[model samples]
Target: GLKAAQKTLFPLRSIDDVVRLFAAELGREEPDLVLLSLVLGFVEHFLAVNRVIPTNVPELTFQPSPAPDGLTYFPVADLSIIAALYARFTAQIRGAVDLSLYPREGGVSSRELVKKVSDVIWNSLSRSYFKDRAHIQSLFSFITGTKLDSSGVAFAVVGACQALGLRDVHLALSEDHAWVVFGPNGEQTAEVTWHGKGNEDRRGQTVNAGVAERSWLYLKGSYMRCDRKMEVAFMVCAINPSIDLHTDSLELLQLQQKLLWLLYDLGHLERYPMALGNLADLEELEPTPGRPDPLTLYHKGIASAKTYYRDEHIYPYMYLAGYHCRNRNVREALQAWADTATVIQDYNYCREDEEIYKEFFEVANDVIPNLLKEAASLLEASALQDPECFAHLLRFYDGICKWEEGSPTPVLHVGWATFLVQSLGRFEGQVRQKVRIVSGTVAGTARGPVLTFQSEKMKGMKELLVATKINSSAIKLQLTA
Candidate 1:
């Protein structure tokens, strides 16, 4: 009976329920159920196609690796399947958009639109099933001998669209494209375009336009001004390049698969603070063999970083990432993020010289930590810091101490004294004193029996008292107050 129920829910079950089960097992609250479902479906489909599971499922097949040629070729049928999946996904997206706006009667708000699109994209990509992505690369190796390339995929997509009755398609030197189609009246009926990079800027630049106009600009090009009779079409540009058709490079393909997974994960989470940190790490590493388009990697890194900051509202990091995204631009960001990894590993001096290294560490110590302290202070001032942000910081500080010992990254100390200071800044008199007391305790130790005093002035006196403990009780109360 259990087996039967499992089978019933296996392939077609809503991804939310599956993810909820997964999250529950991991002790995490379920976030964005629709996205979880999409991710699950992708993983399930990929697993089925790869023959990872035993079944009569129609699997995607490709040539095995170590061939003389560098490109792996997918059967046209697989491409068709990909296209169909994307089409269905987009259709559902349109439906969701309609549903969300139906009750408002005033159309979808900008924030809602961004959230919907982000959710749809993220959920579609990051599935636990795709956790073993090495298999996908093996398939890629069999189909195309060499590693995947973003430019190749862009060309292929453009070609595919051309073959589907689109006309006047033109590819740019930078791997962007524009297309136009004419109607029976000898007038241009539809037009679309895509840019491989500068997506964020374009998005920001195109805000507040009507849906059709935005769609047209997103698909065709902002320069392709259309007549009233012309219809707008939009196409999403995939970040992956086409796999080399002749040479077997499973490792490289696997890397690409990882990137796809990363993209999907970023899409779902609505932010990528951790991803930005990782991208900074990657920028310091050596470039992977045969995957030379640093710009693609850089864009992904920037996107990850942007998502991290935007979602977390880590404004300092956001400002940093945004500054990088706009100024040095994509190619530079890639070189900084993707090509620098090797330098980081091999050359100690590189750490001192690299811009990202300097910026990241500086921000870590000066900007983020300070901002965190200010935020804590505000909360503490309101007496909301201790049980809320302050406690969270204590957990964060503990995590960080452990991380500093061996963990790759340190967790933010959310229960730190700084949180109280920030929180206290928000309150009035007596509550302000209590916040000061809390802050003093936090500043004195990493662990604590939090000290609370009756009066505002007394809390200030406690801070003065604790300052004297710095010498005598340095080992005990001062160390872990």
Candidate 2:
């Protein structure tokens, strides 16, 4: 009986059936025959195996976990999750055994999100009991010996994303590496999964979960690139890193699933007789913890895009372009943008993406150009080629721009927009950069061009005329007659 299967436990009818089956083992049963035949069949098999009268029945033991629904937890050792999922192990295998067959979609609740975060040799279950691939696969394996090979972790992650509606994650193909990315409560966030050193590498599971305790270039180098880049189809969203791994699981699953689809999308972009090119194998792109993630360089691209109407949202195309923008020179930037634009017109697209991104797409048209104008002058040489400057902002505002009108981050956003514009006290020394004109209606045709800027002492606040001249005259004319 199962806890959920209250009526399924023992019953008089079930008992009779069990007893009859047990008798059949001692005797035997055919549709026409009964107990006597079952006894003879058993005796025959027994004689075959033992024949030596008092033969040995294999003495094996198993103890199931104790719960109200006792039998479900039966310690059927060999029957439980033991050796490789498919005896010798299949090409696909994913995560450990766990409670749910499918992650409760939408999100993880507090029980999973909070609770521990303790001395914490981290546990994924402790964080959020997600869909266990091993268990799901096991259940499938028991029912049928063919077709449905319930593949492990990667498959489980695929299910988690499909079931839980997660986003912002990636999967390392075949090698069994998956990383869950997120920006936490401004802390050293970004919950990660890794394989620890003290454990068995050759046979044990490499996918391990833990808070990414440290890393300056935290997420940069972790990305694995391919000659054919996957589209950037992830939604414009960021989960509060504050949530536990369970919740993080939801985001993680979604992240990879979208990317997974892009893999298929990539097949179209791929050419036959694939070029080996200069790109290294995926292993070479791996993160070296102490150093900057070198692959951050690959994020930029500028292939031209096809054009179409505004409402059509070609998510895959936008995402592909995003790689270059995130991964750029302005020429590269403009190239990425142009290519993205061209494809929207050229390709048969998904209108749903446009609808989803309409707000971003619409605002981006204006927001990006404005930000570009302001950014061009603001960027320092060191930061000029960073690839993050204008594009990330475009990526950001496109995703988050909706929130300004929304209730959460827009209105009651806890960090306080009031603080976004802090007030520094008055002036110090000379200013290298010139002032900007706010608004002035000049009376005299050629009077003067005064400048205004954010107050020097108060860095965040409004106008101060410190850089501009108030009086236009410097006359050293004669007081002499």
Candidate 3:
């Protein structure tokens, strides 16, 4: 066997320590190239610190270099290779996912979410990210889930969110705990635990309460392998509702679930602690009923937001607000959107930009009335619109606004028409035979007439079809078979 310029690749267990250690050095809001530079510097540091490569390695060292104007990359060699590794890992995970399908779980189904994230992490060019462990971890403090004390959960959730092109999620922090939250503006939360069958259905509000409440016990020196000091992350071993509770699959990542069950399910994590004799019942740990459709039974509250923003859960409230504007609840919806905006005006992100959050508040206040109009329009379009249609419409437009205008959050709303149309068709339930909607676009993509259907069913549904349109050059008058 031939030896190369390497030890054992930093047997990197987690990026927790590095993220905390260098938060300052990385600088606030630096460019991706600089961010990319920092990662390389860390990699170089990792190699050099561990002495994988000599400090004098030709063309392969990281230094105090900033990009000159018009230059896209650092001049150092091996940067590309490092980036390629990150790209390669992200690409692999990206291939197997459909970010469009993310909200199917209302955005916080961990089995659904974790598997996707861990799949990418576990499968990506050896668990690397285009951004790497720290890049993803550092951002978690600000976005969706507020702050997880455990790197493992953070790693799993953050990895999943990025892998699937989701940016609206984060590790939400409670007074003394952390858990998962996802949706526009971090609207809903999911507290993890190995308790009570692990379904999205909560037995009650405090079913797993106090389990994750233990403060992370930060100790000395050693880091990242999720040690005692690893308390910087949330405790997972034990492991929500809005204004609807749903049942979905709870298939856990094997190694993690089993190990956690063995380590914590014995009841020590609780205040009433189980007797040692009770450990005999360990084999009876809850069995997952397998993954269920994410939408089957989900929770909903009229006004929900990150606990960090007790004032207003904009994402959830937006949906509720817009939904109400669809029908008899117009005034109710209006109030909801208005309330959410005011609350957002005061949100202080986790040492990230204060301005971006402000933009959301501004965009939100402006969008409320437009959403009211759109809501009415959506109802008129669907005609047979249900509570679901309003929610779907709200979700669709929320995405369109964020993506079209660009939000600091990486939320994207696609296929409102696709799903809306399919759902409408499903709701009506006459089962159309041999119908397909094709886009004979300039190249068959965005901005054009976006539907095709049986003339019989859709004949006068111009109201439904119009909203899906955005005028542009027509298809070159091609005839269909």
Candidate 4:
């Protein structure tokens, strides 16, 4: 009777029901991220079946077998099965690491304890399979499938640490990478997972090298230091809405959105710009009637970055620009792109930061060009008439040039110069001169007027367009400077 009664609980029939459960889970002083992740993964991966099974059934009786379409097919999953899975996962983590052997005073974390938990996740990953797949970033997938992605690996280590009573071990997140933070005062950091494709997994190394390189991937020691609820938000943020390329499960999407909203309402997302950007993107796709508009949501994301991250984050700006571009708001998009450049100026470009490098490259080479092409006549007649638009274009180029100055790798090539000259050609001479270029040093500044636009004076502007047909190599060198 007790076993039969367990099956009757956790009846997650609709998105509304799931949100209520999530809110209840999060309302607790200490929410179990493992339980939430497993529940999410189960709901996401397993298709809901209408048939009611008999009582006293084993949890493994519903274990999904791989289907013909490469997806697993399972009966409807409920909290009982998820609870059993949670027990198993935590048991595995506990069985593998003897926490008593490495006990520390006041339950503080140490390098070796963190590394041992990390190695458990690292070693358990399935060998010789694609590591970049979706829907694998949860304890459900990890326990049943023996697979995980880069972020998944990092998450599991932290999740495992949580199970082992290492409350001090928390997740550290950058815009593009994930790690762990521990030790007394939470001052220590460790790379708990690999990042990007085919990179070496430095599971236990401290993050001093990446930070010293001024890599934007690291965010200069100012990345998000997530607490338990924030880690829950990361798990929710990691929820992949896609079931296939052209299809999405409405239930999963709704669940992810509702969970994010839960986190937002709880004030956990105020400092998390990326999560805000993610929420903004979803709202843009399908506007929630009573919520903020997509544009305001994006602005909130940028505001979060400015308030908490020293405006060091780049994605919030990119997310806003992408929204504007999608809606054919070319002028606002250009300004956002310029703002993105301003953020990039604070960090040196490196190979490890290549994922972000690709983002900027696409914006500059592909997105901006395509926007200009589609709105060529309108931009030439209207945007070109505004000197501020021309100044924004100059500032955009100036940022990338500044980013290239101290980088080990060259950020711009002849191809970039070609587009620059072409983009500059769109603005006529009078519009260009209305925006003045100054080179004066301002008081109380190490560098002043590196590039400033003054709308007052308009002279000596012939050089702006004189050398349009210059050689590629020379143009590349000159443009970078």
Best by lDDT: 4
TM-score, prediction 2: 0.23
Note each model's CA RMSD in angstroms.
Answer: 21.3, 23.7, 23.9, 5.9
User: How do these models rank on lDDT, best leading?
Assistant: 4, 3, 1, 2
lDDT of each residue in 1-481, candidate 2, tens digit only: 0122211222212223323332323221211111111222222222222223332435323233333324311112231222222232222222332225534335432223211111011232232233332122221222122111212222223223322223322223211123332212211122223232133322222222211311111111232221112211111011111123342322223322222223323442222101111011121323324422223322211111112112222233344344334443343444444333432322221211223234234424443444344445565342223333322322232223222222121211222221211100011113211223343576658731233222121222212312222111111010000
Model 3 poorest ten-residue lDDT run = 472-481
* Full candidate order by TM-score, most accurate first: 4, 3, 1, 2
Ten residues in a row with the worst lDDT in model 1? 228-237
Per residue, candidate 3 scores C-alpha lDDT tens digits across 1-481 of: 1012121222222332223222332232321221222243333233222334455656355333232343121123343444444454355556667666655544344346544553443332222223212222322121222222233344444444544545444544432223445544454444432121123533113312333321111001010122221121222222100001332112112212333333333322221111111111222233335421211111122211232123323344544454455444544554554444443333323212333344444433344435444545666533223333333323333332322222233221232233334333322322121122342446656761133322222223323433334211111110000
Tens-digit per-residue lDDT, 398-425, candidate 4: 6777787678988887677778766776
* Model 3: CA > 4 A from native: 1-44, 47-49, 52-59, 62-78, 100-115, 118-156, 173-179, 184-187, 191-208, 211-481
Maximum-TM-score candidate = 4
